[PDB]
With several copies, the nearest count.
Chain A
Amino acid sequence: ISLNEEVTFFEKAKRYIGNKHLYTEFLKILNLYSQDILDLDDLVEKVDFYLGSNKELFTWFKNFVGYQEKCEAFGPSYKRLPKSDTFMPCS
């Protein structure tokens, strides 16, 4: 039944993630979503790095949370200056 997987999703997740130290981070990430700190799209993107290979599992997880596929992309290199410093003149 569809219930069978969900009651075992964390067991299936635990086996693949392997070592506990990586499984703990998987739980912490799942926590932040349930605390409304982490957005759903950001959660699915992070879970991808965990459950990416298990396509049959990751697809189920994407189905479960309701993720639907198809600015803040600032980039690491560049930082914004304040408005005042931009006034130094050009003739």
Chain B
Amino acid sequence: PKISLQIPIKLKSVLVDDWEYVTKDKKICRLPADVTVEMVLNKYEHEVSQELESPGSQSQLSEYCAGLKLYFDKCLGNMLLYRLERLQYDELLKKSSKDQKPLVPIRIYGAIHLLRLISVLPELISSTTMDLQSCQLLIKQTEDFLVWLLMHVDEYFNDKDPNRSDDALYVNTSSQYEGVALGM
């Protein structure tokens, strides 16, 4: 049928409230972000590694973890960004071009964008041809992944030391910038 994936209730607020800010406040994350996608996800490969005793369970952990680092790279420019965000994304490619170094989404963006990918995830498997058994696992790390997130949801999703604007993930931007973000 349709793939059933359960977001933790607080994480549901995190994304839904966050979508409110970009559309209304028009804030944009300082990039590279305070907490990169990498060290958030690479660390998951570290703690959960010391918890699983089986050989396969260690392989599946690094399997799903390394893939997410790969999947986020191709799936950033396609889907995860907003209309306002897309204008900010365009600059990066020129900025990467000016350095001539390849643009690497995973090291630069923050973990909240990774959370955006997981929300869009269950729709994406629907288009794919994976049988049920494979889909189960893709989901089973995903649910167990977000179970980690609640432990440190306060650190980087939730504003720690919220008084400083830098601690806030998204920072307000100029209106004439938003006019370009409209494109008209």
Q: Do any beta carbons of A and B sit within 8 angstroms of each other in the complex?
A: yes
Contact with B along A72-91 (1 / 0, CB 8 A): 00100001111101000000
Q: Does B183 sit within 8 A of A, measured CB to CB?
A: no
Contact with A along B28-56 (1 / 0, CB 8 A): 00100000000000000000000000000
In the assembled complex, 20 residue pairs joining A and B whose CB atoms fall closer than 8 Å, in A order, are A74-B163, A79-B162, A79-B163, A79-B172, A80-B162, A80-B163, A80-B164, A80-B166, A80-B172, A81-B171, A81-B172, A81-B174, A82-B30, A82-B162, A82-B166, A82-B171, A82-B172, A83-B166, A85-B174, A85-B177
A36-91 interface with B by 8 A CB criterion: 74, 79-83, 85
Complex CA distance for A79 and B166, rounded to whole angstroms: 12
**Complex: chain B residue closest to A74, CB-CB:** B163
Complex CA distance for A69 and B109, rounded to whole angstroms: 48
B contact residues around A80 at 8 Å (CB): 162-164, 166, 172
Chain A residues with a Cβ under 8 A of chain B: 74, 79-83, 85
Complex CA distance for A83 and B171, rounded to whole angstroms: 10
A contact residues around B30 at 8 Å (CB): 82
B contact residues around A81 at 8 Å (CB): 171-172, 174
B contact residues around A82 at 8 Å (CB): 30, 162, 166, 171-172
**Complex: chain A residue closest to B28, CB-CB:** A82
Complex CA distance for A82 and B172, rounded to whole angstroms: 7
Query: What is the distance, in angstroms, from A50's C-beta to the closest C-beta of chain B?
Result: 22
Q: Which of A80, A81, A82, A83 has the largest count of B CB atoms less than 10 A from its CB?
A: A82
B contact residues around A79 at 8 Å (CB): 162-163, 172
Complex CA distance for A81 and B177, rounded to whole angstroms: 11
